[PDB]
Design a protein around this nucleic acid. Structure first.
Length: 248
RNA sequence: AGCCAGGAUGUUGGCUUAGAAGCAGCCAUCAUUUAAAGAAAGCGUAAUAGCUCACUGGUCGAGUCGGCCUGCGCGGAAGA
RNA sequence: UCCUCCUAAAGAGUAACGGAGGAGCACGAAGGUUGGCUAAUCCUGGUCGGACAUCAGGAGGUUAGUGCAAUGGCAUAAGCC
RNA sequence: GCUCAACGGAUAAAAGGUACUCCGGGGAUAACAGGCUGAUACCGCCCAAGAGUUCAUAUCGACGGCGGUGUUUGGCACCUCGAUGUCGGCUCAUCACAUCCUGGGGCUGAAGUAGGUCCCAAGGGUAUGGCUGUUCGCCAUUUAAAGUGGUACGCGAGCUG
RNA sequence: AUGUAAA
RNA sequence: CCCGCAGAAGAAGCACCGGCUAACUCCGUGCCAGCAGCCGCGGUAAUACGGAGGGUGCAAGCGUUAAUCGGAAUUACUGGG
RNA sequence: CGGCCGCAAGGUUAAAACUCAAAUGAAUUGACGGGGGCCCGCACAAGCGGUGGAGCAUGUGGUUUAAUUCGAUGCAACGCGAAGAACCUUACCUGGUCUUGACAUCCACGGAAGUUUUCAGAGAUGAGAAUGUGCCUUCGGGAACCGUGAGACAGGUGCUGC
RNA sequence: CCAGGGCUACACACGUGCUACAAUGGCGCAUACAAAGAGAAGCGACCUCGCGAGAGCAAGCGGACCUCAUAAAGUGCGUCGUAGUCCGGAUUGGAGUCUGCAACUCGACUCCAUGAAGUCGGAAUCGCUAGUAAUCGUGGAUCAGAAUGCCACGGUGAAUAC
RNA sequence: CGCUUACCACUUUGUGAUUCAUGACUGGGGUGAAGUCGUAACAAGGUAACCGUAGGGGAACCUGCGGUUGGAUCACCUCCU
RNA sequence: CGCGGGGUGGAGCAGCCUGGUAGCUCGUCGGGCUCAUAACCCGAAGGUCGUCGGUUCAAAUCCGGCCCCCGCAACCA
């Protein structure tokens, strides 16, 4: 698919046990960087908020190329961790969780034409005071944009043109703000659906370090490695999910 | 210029095998029978089929078809 | 306030809140005379040395320079020692 | 001895407000309007990629261009400063069609109704309330329609303020 | 100063 | 209500099994599915979830839910500080 | 919230909804005190010679690769397991092979075991040629060795020191 | 199971040791003093050759006799005059020797030639109270060959503890 | 019988009390194996704590005044009864 | 384009006025101190002063030209 061949945004965020989960989020950045350098992908750190004892709390990173999103679709969700940590003086198995969002490109086709043939321009007389000027005048412009319903009212100066330029700048600013607000709501409504609450619930993937097991909740794989997984080579987990996803 | 005629057999052609087949787009834009036919300019079909023009015959039988230079005009040219 | 090109219609002159820019200095020498010389920019070769330091050769011709922003002029040099 | 730089230099020596103002004047010079033009605005046309299951031309139409009107903002000050009262509202209207409806027709991407676009046609009609002083606009409900403009953005020797 | 969670 | 016909012929389920409180193992997941009146289990050796076997309890009823009293002397007059 | 008092701040009386199976008081034993008293250790004081500045040797973390085998990873890991990685060791990887097997036992059949030598292949192996043919005779068999076939199994330096 | 590669890779950091940065020191000659050990598919006298690592021949010893095995710092004498220098020895090239089937990744040793950083070390940190620190040499386990590591022995040998 | 008066239901008007839902916004309360900042209380908790009151500060809180030990130390001063 | 402020480690400022020297702070990396983090200490990198030309014995500086960032870019009757 055309969308597939697209690049991606990876957003790795810490959940339960934010001290430990930052350490696992840094290692997941290491996981997907070792998976990305194996197939020659470009990794750029756009934003990374550090933790306390190492790692990172939130990582937003662009990966560009030819086919990142179509090859990393099934990574949005949770990751449980059973591990014996280093920030402990007791030596007990603790569980943490990390949440990973995978966003597509969605390339910015911004600034549509203002369409003055579709703009309704009403140049009528002004309210306010101080001059006859006002009386013989007009000097007040209201411009309505029909397919959105945005009205711009300007009664600033004595002349229409110097108010025409202000009215068109306010039209451009309000249309750009209303489009970018819808785009940021469309980002957030998908990020709230992909990223859950961040709790220790089962969300499609596990990481069982003392057992030596990787057991996902979809396509029940039982790979007993944790050494060909921690250094790239994530083909055996991602490929059969794609195999039984193409059947639907 | 009008008028009864013709305006073919493989071309379901190889093409991305779901089909583009004279006429979406590719390129090739063959060759025979030949009074004549472009492997096609348009209409119409999922594609066909079909309908015209290209061109060639015949009745017909005198002038006709398309460009350049200008003069005077036509329309665009609708107010309180 | 003053200087330089156009505007400005081939003598002089000529206006606009016209189009481009500068000056309110400097010089005991950069002035006078005499004597002598011709650059800029490229090419080749050469120790540091490299596009550009200096040297030798060749092209080139006053596009260089004339203290200063511009015009005219300059080898008989007004340029350089 | 003067950046007396307002630089042919009124004093050696000087900033502001007047809507409390006042006088001699000016259309030599502005505001409101009338006048000339039409950069702008509105409308019409030429070319044509393209949108439209095909298909520029049912309806649109980029990139470009040519015209009409004097309805908006504009430009110049030709008339007015020994006086032309301007906005909005009430009453009273008049005219042009670049027609909102009614009427007669053509195309349609018009099965009928309901439609889109275009031509002729000004004979008649062309809202009611809230807000805002507001023209205008939004809302609520009708209507067949809630037309655009000119007439000193009509009308104060007709009326408020 | 601080060192969150699974006897 | 009594007599006769025929043939074991037509007639057994429900809850619980860690403690309170009567009764034990195996398999399947794996702080997930889930149970639970309280303490609470399940984080790959579960007498606590699901299934099987076995047992326990009650019986044409068995569990859950709702209400009253007792235990609760945790409304104390009997019978508290 | 309501009533009353007060100039105010506010005071007095005084609930309900909802959550939890704890909250509390006394006292015992350990832990700790930047609490006190006492005592000890190169613990502090005094000095000696070092490390950290340089090169080499080794190990680890990290990076890369086919693996850079695995464990140890605060004192109590880091010239540690390893009292010694060219092959061997090797548990890792690439390539080629074997599967009741390289190693332990049972059944049936066949063959002294062994030695020398040659061909192809990286070699394991595959294909051969000679020689030797005993220790007890139920002599259809033995006590070892070797090859074939089937099942029991063997094997694992694979995981769990929770 | 076999052949090869890897465990020795390298932009970086740390731990532990050796050699140093020199004149109580380097070089050359002469010379004195040890203990503890190991040895047979081993130690390997003596003689000869090679500048050399070692090679050829070949006694003794499974051992208080035989071998490894000349102990070094220490002493005398000569030189070097405080310079990155006659200190230090990394790295590199050539020719080599031992072992092993094979020394290229990836062993040890010797010669020639080159001969860097380093001129006493930042924050900070370690061990020691005696034959101890510090310095110097030797042997063994591992092992066909392969340590500065480990174990063990000996020579000189302080200072401080109020 | 009819009329008229007195009692009088349904209903209407005016003004209050009480109660139930709803109401933009705002305050405090309770829960949440992870979020940000500070370490205020438990040792003399590193400024002893607690209570009442007034003020201040992002916040545990701080400051002043009054009360209480539901607080440690009292072989470091010197000299002692 | 016209006017103004400028271009100094990765970043913010001194230092330009008034010439003789590249400086400070935050930040990055690495090592210590702690069982670990924070704090603290030490060391290293980093800019030639946006660029070019001229005066000067000497331009981070004085002046001019070019490039880049930000702000003001026609209004009050």
């Amino acid at each position: 698919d055309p969308d597939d061949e697209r690049n991606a945004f990876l957003e790795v965020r810490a959940g339960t046990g934010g001290d430990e989960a930052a350490l696992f989020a840094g290692d997941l950045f290491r996981m997907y960087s070792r998976y990305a350098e194996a197939r020659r992908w470009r990794v750029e750190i756009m934003s990374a908020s550090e933790g306390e004892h190492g790692g990172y709390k939130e990582i937003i990173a662009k990966i560009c190329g030819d086919g990142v999103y179509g090859r990393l679709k099934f990574e949005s969700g949770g990751h449980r961790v059973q591990r014996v940590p280093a920030t402990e003086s007791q030596g007990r198995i603790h569980t943490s969780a990390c949440t990973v969002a995978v966003m597509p490109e969605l390339p910015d086709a911004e600034l549509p034409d203002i369409n003055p043939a579709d703009l309704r321009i009403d140049t009528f007389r002004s309210s306010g005071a101080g001059a006859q000027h006002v009386n013989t005048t007009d000097s007040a412009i209201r411009i309505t944009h029909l397919p959105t319903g945005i009205v711009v009212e300007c009664q600033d100066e004595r002349s229409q043109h110097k108010n025409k330029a202000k009215a068109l700048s306010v039209l451009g600013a309000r249309i750009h703000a209303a489009e970018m607000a819808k785009r940021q709501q469309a980002e957030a409504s998908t990020r709230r659906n992909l990223l859950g609450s961040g709790d220790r619930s089962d969300r499609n993937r596990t990481y069982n370090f003392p057992q030596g097991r990787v057991t996902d909740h979809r396509i029940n794989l039982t790979l007993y490695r944790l050494d060909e997984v921690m250094e790239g080579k994530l083909d055996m987990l991602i490929e059969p999910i794609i195999q039984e996803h193409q059947a639907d």
